Design a protein around this nucleic acid. Sequence first.
DNA 1: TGTAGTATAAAAAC
DNA 2: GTTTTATATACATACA
Lengths: 180, 50, 46, 104
Amino acid sequence: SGIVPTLQNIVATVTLGCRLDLKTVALHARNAEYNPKRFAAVIMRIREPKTTALIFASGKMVVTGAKSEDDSKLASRKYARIIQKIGFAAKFTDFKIQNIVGSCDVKFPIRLEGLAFSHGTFSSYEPELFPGLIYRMVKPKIVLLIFVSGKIVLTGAKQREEIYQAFEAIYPVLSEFRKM
Amino acid sequence: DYLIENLMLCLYDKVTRTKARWKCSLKDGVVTINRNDYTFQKAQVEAEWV
Amino acid sequence: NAEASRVYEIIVESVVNEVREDFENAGIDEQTLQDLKNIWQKKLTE
Amino acid sequence: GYYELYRRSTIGNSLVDALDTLISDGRIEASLAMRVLETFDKVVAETLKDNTQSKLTVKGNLDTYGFCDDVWTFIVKNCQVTVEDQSVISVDKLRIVACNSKKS
DNA sequence: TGTAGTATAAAAAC
DNA sequence: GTTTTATATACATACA
């Protein structure tokens, strides 16, 4: 096709290599929340790249919301520097992208029921529960959410090419079940 | 920057956020703004973090 | 404004009257308590 | 069991300064000033709860926010504050410090 | 009565 | 159970 999924969210993990006192981090970093009754981590945000980090006492960190691999790593380095500047022996090790989410629009309605029946082992469609058809693709290993509108969500990728190949594989099927 | 007067001092009942849109329901406070003071039973804050 | 000026007057009058017992327990002075009240209102006015 | 945050208000700062002056003149001891401030903490809390009726609306850009130890702190920039009991006030920068209405 | 929060449905860290 | 993000339905709850 001439349609390429748009990347929407990238989640990555980073190991800072030192234990952290979360209250100290929250008291010295701007835009930080530390509520141990809610979640054992400091939740911090930066405007650029626009992301949210979950920072743990173990020094492990999760960075979410980036739209490109470059932004994911840059944002992660920025959080590491903030922690370093507060006074912790934080390093930037084992950066790893864990999940990439993409979306696209084929611009034509889909007969979800007929699609689910024909691809029963990969499909889950209970419209009264959730309006999208949940398609679990084997190769590449990607989960797609297919809607009547023709809008598609693709998730579970470790690299962007998996999002692209999953859409290419599903396109013929979507066309096969186009509405009216 | 990243590391750590008109001042409002009060209590919060609820703080919520959707995307970058924050809403805070505050109560029992006092605030000095532009050199004048105001006391209040309730206050609602709607601010965008952008 | 009316509400704020009013709240401040309530606070000052209530604090002064409520700490008279602590003041007396420390054997301070009624005139000293009145001085606290006046310096406080003065600095508030400033 | 009352928050000390109001000591930072205009009325609170004035009381602190007044107490400090009497201490400096050797008229009262710091121990009494502490009891006076503790009473102030309670009186302000009760007065703001029972003797206010106005409602304010604050709208603007959220510059910074933070939460730690049951306290939310926000810095709002270029905001408009509406006071109702017809008055719209504009502020370049407003710092908001809020303690949990549910105390621990 | 038409405008404007909850619930439902990959991955890591705790 | 948090956090992020595209997507879309039903149902709740305010308010002029």
